[PDB]
Every structure is written in structure tokens, then in C-alpha cells.
């Protein structure tokens, strides 16, 4: 039959062939020998700081490819505008070593990178992304204004809108525009004397970095961290987000009246800010993007992981469950309720959020659309399937082919 | 070359050097990862009408024999050397060779040990091995299979076992067990293409009827075994009801649960996989251990294409099945898994929940890291179908690759 990967859905018995994977120009971590697919950070995409300007030869072919994708998307491949834009990039790279993107080209690549993200289950919304062009930004102070504007438009008083703000691309031998915090909104992680952590253990390093930079630390379990913004060749400046801009949601349970007394809460805007956006060779080191949460992100990973808030035991104890024996499924029960609490608290506060059932179903729809439009959809199974009730959602039964397509979002080294 | 493996719950890190011993290829390539695929597109076990290339078979054998002698600390010894010459001698003259019982036993245990998808490998060292290469008829396979079942079941105190029938032979049919497990409930296609019983067993159920089985009309009708001897039409054999133990499902507090009339068998025994040791292929080598609650409560009873009883329990639990956000599905799933554990514990039948199971697997990873420098594991199969991140394995990176001896998938005999 077809000489492309055969993909099967064991629920419906249907079959497909991903032919889009042939389009992947970049290798991943696997080899016919062993599969390193479960690795979170395989040393592959990892955009390690490559100071000295890139091989004009390599950058060019990467650029020629993107421009082709662009004209193809506007249905003018082979046209005169297409060949001229091509000559325009080659010429520019010939005389300066790099090149720049047209407004509409940036919008297209930004959406494509989201569209190409293997780990994102909410890609059915890929077509609807507000792109803020901030390639004019020239100061860490200005970066803060842009971000504040982004948070304002994205939060939109609970009726969340996906968006991304693109700052100046990396320049030959010049400093990068970086955001030190992993997310625009992060709770503090206070290292205690006994060795424990107050707040979110995930953010201990960034919290300690904000202190070494002049932040006056609080002592709560949910203190919002300040942003460490870094303009080219300058030490990072520190900014404190206006509390009114950071919308949060106190958590309560629909029937367990005591849950509200736990004082648990979560912020509404999920915005990655430390990922690198790559388009046609150009690298955008600072390009924060945001959408809206899928309840399991808050209810299962952030609130229940061993290395995060780890509230499973406390909650189970309040439910009067037998936390002394694994066979009581006390973990499963408290997890369900905690997740139900996130959903209920967000809906009540009229803030955008989607549950893992609704989410995955729509991702199935996304796969069917992409199957027709591109002949496949790159997906990372372990990331698409929810952290709870896995085989209860439809993606669990859907085989998935994983691979790297550009534009793309890549991980990048911490500036420090 | 050697993959850095990290656990994101502890920050610990290890290097897998065991993958270096992989002489077989997977489906993955640097271009794209096909790891979430269940079956191999090409890594199958093609027919055996001709003899395997002696040069190759010989090298798989030499290596396995090396493996066997190293295991008993008699490497390079006299026995090791004279055993290699025996195998060289036999292969050169007949194009094949045979294994000695002890070697078989070593191989069988290694195959389990190398099983990437198995979460209960901490038990790999405790396996009762029944040598059934002394078998010559389907009627003999049946007796053999009945003993395995009697032993393995052990009145509810399950013990892990495997029974090995004759290896494959060039230009000769393979001994085969048509059924995928020694115990399966029939799947009867009724009215509107819907199904009564177990949907995954529609085909096997039909093939049985086609060979003279008097079908039933229940949701849990224990199927018969279609045993097949080389180049002979398969035969039908009914299992003695007293041999097939079963657990009726009821709930700790939900009085109405038992009313649902749900039940499941005690013995999980695969019978359609192939065991490969030192190049020799065993097409009929049924094996079993004991169920992990989630296989029953989550996959078998709740999969959409299986019994799919989720909505019923939800309605009985008087839940809001109008919307997804009420998490009525996650809620029912948990009570059903709770029921399976309760019922099995009440009937005194061996069973392990997914929390206990994954904790012990973590230990196994550790025991293996020190013992061989790594442990081949398929993440998507090790992490339970529910409460994934709630278990330790979820937060553990894993490397997957093929080691031999090994259990492999093989084409259906029909
Ligand atoms: C509209 C709602 C959206 C939802 C519900 C959604 C949900 C998710 C979830 C559940 C994850 C994985 C979380 C984890 O396991 O840590 C994820 C990852 C990701 N999403 Fe989305 N997403 C949405 C919007 C966005 C937007 C707007 C972009 C980009 C423009 C995007 C890009 C990505 C990328 C790159 C990843 C992987 C990041 C990594 O590797 O850590 N998502 N998304
Ligand atoms: C002691 C009890 C054992 C437990 C609790 C256990 C549990 C499991 C589980 C949960 C799976 C995945 C099942 C699925 O999702 O379909 C699995 C797969 C597997 N186990 Fe074990 N196992 C045990 C004993 C055995 C034994 C005795 C062998 C062989 C000697 C074995 C060989 C394998 C193999 C080959 C697979 C993968 C099969 C496939 O690819 O379909 N297991 N085991
Ligand atoms: N997850 C969403 N619902 S919207 C996309 C941004 C996002 C927000 C929060 C978490 C992660 C997952 C990766 S977290 C990281 N690489 N800093 C992504
Ligand atoms: N799973 C256990 N508790 S013991 C191993 C036997 C076993 C029983 C049930 C299911 C599967 C996995 C897929 S079954 C197959 N490849 N026909 C293996
Ligand atoms: Zn892979």
C-alpha cells in the first residue's frame, strides 16, 4: 500500500496515512534503534545560543521554504510576487546576512507554528490567533507595556482570546530580547529552612532570581511573581504586574462546602513566555503566546503533581478517604473532585476554560480537518492524552505520528 | 549515543546503555516517531516455509547461548564451549537446532523481562515454565492448556506461568492457538450490527460457530478454544466450567451495582503472541500472570468499543450525563475500578491496582538500572488508562527498544 506511516484509530477501526511527515525538514530524537519519544527535552530542537551569524547558505534555504509556504497559503505559488519576494530575501541576506518578514508573513508563520505544535491539544483554534507585531520594541520598559497590553486583550475580563506578541528577532552578534519567567503569570516558590517550599516548587529558581534582582519577596502560597524583562545587551530590569491586570479565580467545590476554605486559587491567563518562535530561519527569542486552560492543567498537574502543590493528600483527608491503602483509590477520588472544582470555579467566575472531554473531542475534529488539508497532523501522544481519565477520552485510541514542522515553537536555553 | 533519562518528580538522571545491545529495529526514524502505534507495519514474523539463513540464525543462537551461560556464571567454561559446538553442529546439518529445558526456562523469563509494555516485570524472576514441546496433537494442546489453567489459577492465588508448544519448523504449519486469550467472552453480532457480549471478540466468536460451536446468547459466555496442529484444520475444545474461575462484580457501598450483573474472569493469559529465543520461534506459547484492576475496570468494561458500560453506571449513580464538564465519566470510571478491586479481593483472587503496580515497576526500573544499565519501556503502555499523572511512572522518562529473547506479535492463522 502507501509508503507513508499507517495510522489507526482502534475505537472506530478507521485508517489514515500521514503524508505530511515527509515535509519535516528537521530530525527528532528517535532512531530505528530506540524510541526516545517520552523525553520532555531531547537534545534536538533545543535552540542553543548560536552567537556568530548563521551560514547564509542554510538560512537562505530555510527562508526560501517559508516564503514558499506563504505564497502557497495565499494560492499564488509560482507567481511574480512570489519569485520577487524570493529575490528580495536572497538579496537582503546577501548584503546583511539576515532578512526580515512582511507583516502578513509574520501573522501566517505565527499561526503555522501553533498549527505545527505536536504537544498542543487545542489546535482546532489555530486559525483564530491575534498577532501583535512588536518588532519595533527597543526597551525592556517598552516590553512591559506590550505584555501588559497583551494580558489586557487576552484576558478580556474572562472571555479569553488567544494571542501572541512578537518582539525583535535575534540579530547578528547582538543581545536577544528575552523574558526570564517561563510564563507571564507565575506563583512564587519560597525555599524554606526545613528544606520544603512554600508556593509553587516549579518556580523556585525564577523566584530566587527576582530576589537577586531587587524584588521584595512576600511569603504567601500564591504570590504573583514580577517579570524579568531583558532588552538587547542589557541586564534584566524588573517589573511588577498591576494586580488588576492579573485576573485570578478562587476555587470552590459545587457540593463540598469546605473546599472553598482551602484557599486554593489559580490565574486565568496561561501564557508561555520562554519559548522561541522560529520562522523561515529567523529566530524570535521573546514571543509570548497565550490561550485558555484545559481543566486538567490546573486541577491535575499544577495542583496534584508530587513536585507542585501536591494537594492530593490534604484533599483526600478532608473527604475522609482511606489514604493508608492504594486500593481505596483515594488518589483517583480526590483528583476527580479537585478537577470538578476547577471547572466549577471557572464557569462560576465566567472565565474561559475547557474540560479534557470537550477538548480531546475537538482535537479529534482537528485531526480530521488536518487530514484533508495537509495529509496528516504531527502529534505527541503522551501530551495529547489527558493526565486523568486517559482512555475515557477519544485521543487515547487514536494512533499518532510525531515530527517537526516549521514554523515552530522550540525550547531555548535560559538566558542566565 | 547513550540517552539521558530523567524523572521529573525527583530530578534524578540515568544513562541507558542497555539499548546498545539492541540488534532489532523499531518503527521510529529521526524523521518521525511512530511509537504510539500498537502493531508493527513490517516488524512482523513472516512465514516459515523455508529455513532461516544459517549464518544469521547461528549468530542469534550463539548470542543467546552466551547469554545463558553468563547467567549461570559459567561463561567460557567447558560446558559453554561444547554447547556452542552442539548448536553449530546441528544448525549446519539441519538448518536449525533445539533448546535444552533449562535454556528454555532462561529464555522465557528473559522474554518477559525484555517486554517493554509490561508493567508487572518486577515478577519476571518468578515464572513457572511448562515444557510442552512434547506435544503432537490439538487434543494434547488442550490437556496441556487445561493444566496451565488449573495451575496458574490455583484456586484464586494466581501464579504466573507459560506453556511452550513446539517451535516453528520450515515448510510446516505452526501449532497455533486461534484465541487471543485462553479465556474470552463471545461477541455476538445481533440486530442492527450492534453487539451482545464482548465486541473485541466478534471475529473469534464467529470462527468458532463456523466450526460447530453452539453459541449462547449472553454477555459473558465463555468461548471455546480453537487449537490447531500443523497443517490441520483447527479443532474445537470446550473448557470445563470448574476450571474457568470468575469474579462477580459488586460495589463496596453502591448496593445496586451487583444488580448490573457484571462479571470477569480471573486468568489473564495471552495465547496468540510468539516467543522468540535464540532465533527459534515458538508460535504457541501461552502465558499468564494476574490482572491489574484497570485492565478490567477501565479498558475492558469502559472502552467505547468494548462493553462500554460507562453511561449505565452514570445513570444509576444518578449523574448529570447531559454535559462533559460534570465529569460524570471520570466519576463512574472510578467506582467501576473500585468495584473490580473490591470484588476480586472479596473473592480472594489475585489482583493489583494501578498505584501499587506502578510503584513496584519504579523499583523494577531501579533494580534493572543497576543490573543491566537500563530497562526498555513503552511509556504509553506503562502509564495506566486513568489517573495517569497520579502514578509515579507518568513522571518518568523511558527508552524503548527491542531485546531478545522477546515476545512478538504474529499474523492471525486464518
Ligand atoms: C486556545 C486554547 C488552548 C488550549 C486549551 C491549549 C492547551 C494546551 C495544553 C493542555 C498543552 C499541554 C500542557 C502541558 O502538558 O504542560 C499545550 C501545549 C502547547 N500549546 Fe496549546 N493550547 C491552547 C492555545 C495555545 C496557543 C494560542 C498556542 C500558540 C500560539 C499554543 C501552543 C502550544 C505549544 C507550543 C505547546 C507545547 C509547549 C511545550 O512543549 O511545553 N497553545 N496547549
Ligand atoms: C504478574 C502479573 C502481571 C501483570 C500485573 C502484568 C500486567 C500487564 C499489563 C497491564 C500490560 C498491558 C495490558 C494492556 O494494556 O493490554 C501487560 C502487557 C504485557 N505483559 Fe505483563 N503482566 C504480568 C505478567 C506477565 C507475564 C507472566 C508475562 C510473560 C511471561 C507478561 C508479558 C507481557 C507482554 C508481552 C505484554 C505486552 C503484550 C502486547 O503487546 O499486547 N506479563 N502486562
Ligand atoms: N496551556 C494552555 N491552555 S495555553 C498555551 C500556553 C501554555 C500555558 C501554560 C502551560 C503550557 C504547557 C508548557 S509550559 C512551558 N513550556 N513554560 C502552555
Ligand atoms: N495483562 C496481565 N495482567 S498478564 C499478561 C497477559 C495479558 C492479558 C490481557 C491483555 C494483555 C495485553 C494485550 S492482549 C494480546 N496481545 N492478545 C496481556
Ligand atoms: Zn519514537
Short mmCIF file of C-alpha atoms and ligand atoms in Angstrom, two decimals, chain A residues 30 35-37, chain B residues 28 33-35, ligand 5:
data_model
loop_
_atom_site.label_atom_id
_atom_site.label_comp_id
_atom_site.label_asym_id
_atom_site.label_seq_id
_atom_site.Cartn_x
_atom_site.Cartn_y
_atom_site.Cartn_z
CA UNK A 30 14.32 8.70 17.60
CA UNK A 35 12.40 5.39 20.69
CA UNK A 36 13.08 8.45 22.86
CA UNK A 37 9.53 9.80 22.40
CA UNK B 28 10.96 5.06 14.64
CA UNK B 33 8.21 8.97 15.81
CA UNK B 34 5.72 6.11 15.37
CA UNK B 35 5.97 4.95 18.98
ZN1 LIG C 5 9.85 7.20 18.73
#
